[PDB]
Scaffold this active site. Structure first.
Site, PDB file in Angstrom:
ATOM      1  N   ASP A 150      20.425   1.446  29.944  1.00 58.50           N
ATOM      2  CA  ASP A 150      19.160   0.733  29.984  1.00 58.50           C
ATOM      3  C   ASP A 150      19.275  -0.542  29.162  1.00 58.50           C
ATOM      4  O   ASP A 150      19.807  -0.528  28.052  1.00 58.50           O
ATOM      5  CB  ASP A 150      18.035   1.631  29.468  1.00 58.50           C
ATOM      6  CG  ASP A 150      16.678   1.209  29.961  1.00 58.50           C
ATOM      7  OD1 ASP A 150      16.576   0.151  30.610  1.00 58.50           O
ATOM      8  OD2 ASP A 150      15.707   1.943  29.706  1.00 58.50           O
ATOM      9  N   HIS A 223      13.581   1.489  41.188  1.00 60.14           N
ATOM     10  CA  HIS A 223      12.919   1.029  39.973  1.00 60.14           C
ATOM     11  C   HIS A 223      13.212  -0.434  39.682  1.00 60.14           C
ATOM     12  O   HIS A 223      12.295  -1.211  39.403  1.00 60.14           O
ATOM     13  CB  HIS A 223      13.338   1.898  38.789  1.00 60.14           C
ATOM     14  CG  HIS A 223      12.804   1.433  37.472  1.00 60.14           C
ATOM     15  ND1 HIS A 223      11.502   1.642  37.080  1.00 60.14           N
ATOM     16  CD2 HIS A 223      13.401   0.777  36.453  1.00 60.14           C
ATOM     17  CE1 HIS A 223      11.317   1.129  35.882  1.00 60.14           C
ATOM     18  NE2 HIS A 223      12.453   0.594  35.480  1.00 60.14           N
TER      19      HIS A 223
END
Ligand code: MH0
Length: 313
Positions: A150, A223
């Site tokens: 991330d 996403h």
């Protein structure tokens, strides 16, 4: 030339191993406001005194004030986009939770964050109440509790600077920023039941290699597709510092989302594409396993503005 808080610098340096997310509310009275103002005046000195002796400690703190906080501590010349965070009701719910002051402490070690938080809370006494305290760690090679790296697509250097700091558009508050904080709780059993290739369609990238999938083999509900928005045909970026957290002994595995933006509507647009869908109904499947419990918006003033604040008892 207003000196700005270390909003994008820590991320770009890549040395944060631990973080503390302290969200408090000011208790009724004027002594509470005076104490908060004194802390605003002395916060930079406090950070230097806690973190200077530790070479490579990378300690930093970011203080933010909400709309109610601003109303109660300063005047009426509120920043342009400082307002109460609005709850979202689509396929999934994004609540709006209280909070007046936000401290975002980051360091390469936990004891520095612990000591700074202890000093901050001891200099505030009973003037404040604590609404949220969260200790976050780095999960392996910058991964979240879902197993994916991330922060790969965060803007860097001048890009992050133009992404976060307010310019002349609000000339009074130039150098400031806006931030939106959310707390998520994960169901890793449900997430781990899904195969890797599917989870990779849900995210948009590869799991082990951290390579972005080709545009052909990504669904519309990926996403990193619903979070990719444009203004006037140009890509716009926000700065994220999501942090894993939890306690295995109680069963809590979560992610703290923190997003910085010079224009908070960009973050709200991403949040609407996720919770509601783009197009409606086509929501984000991360929300299938992730539950949002808190959400608040804060304005992040400059270091120059904070240091020039007088307690005015
Ligand atoms: C309001 C916005 C927003 C929210 C909420 C949000 C919530 C979450 N996120 Fe995530 N995320 C948001 C905005 C982004 C962006 C803008 C990008 C960059 C995509 C791109 O291609 O530019 C991104 N997220 C990209 C990612 C990526 C991979 C690419 C990268 O790191 O750059 C992961 C793994 C990820 N997120 C995880 C998560 C998780 C887990 C949660 C919550 C549980």
């Amino acid at each position: 030339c207003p000196i700005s808080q270390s909003v994008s610098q820590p991320v770009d340096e890549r040395l944060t191993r631990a973080a503390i997310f302290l969200v408090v509310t000011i208790n009724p009275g004027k002594a509470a406001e005076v104490a908060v103002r004194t802390l605003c005046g002395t916060l930079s000195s406090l950070v230097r005194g806690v973190g200077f002796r530790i070479l490579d400690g990378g300690l930093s703190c970011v203080m933010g004030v909400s709309s109610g906080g601003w109303e109660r501590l300063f005047g009426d010349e509120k920043p342009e986009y400082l307002h109460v965070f609005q709850e979202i009701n689509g396929v999934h719910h994004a609540p709006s939770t209280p909070g007046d002051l936000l401290f975002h402490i980051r360091a390469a070690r936990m004891d520095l964050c612990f000591e700074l938080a202890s000093r901050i809370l001891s200099d505030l006494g009973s003037s404040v109440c604590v609404v949220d305290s969260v200790q976050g760690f780095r999960y392996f090679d910058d991964r979240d509790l879902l197993g994916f790296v991330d922060g790969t697509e965060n803007p860097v250097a001048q890009a992050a600077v133009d992404a976060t700091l307010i310019g002349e558009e609000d000339h009074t508050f130039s150098g400031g920023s806006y931030v939106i904080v959310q707390k998520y709780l994960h169901d890793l059993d449900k997430w781990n039941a899904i195969p890797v290739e599917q989870q990779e369609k849900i995210i948009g990238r590869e799991k082990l290699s951290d390579i972005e999938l080709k545009d052909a083999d990504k669904p519309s509900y990926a996403h990193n597709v619903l979070t990719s928005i444009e203004e006037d045909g140009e890509d716009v970026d926000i700065l994220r510092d999501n942090m894993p957290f939890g306690d295995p002994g109680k069963g809590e595995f979560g992610t703290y989302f923190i997003g910085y933006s010079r224009k908070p509507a960009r973050i709200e647009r991403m949040l609407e594409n996720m919770f509601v869908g783009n197009p409606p109904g086509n929501y984000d499947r991360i929300l299938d396993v992730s539950r949002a419990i808190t959400g608040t918006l804060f304005f992040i003033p400059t270091v120059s503005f904070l240091d020039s604040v007088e307690p005015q008892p």
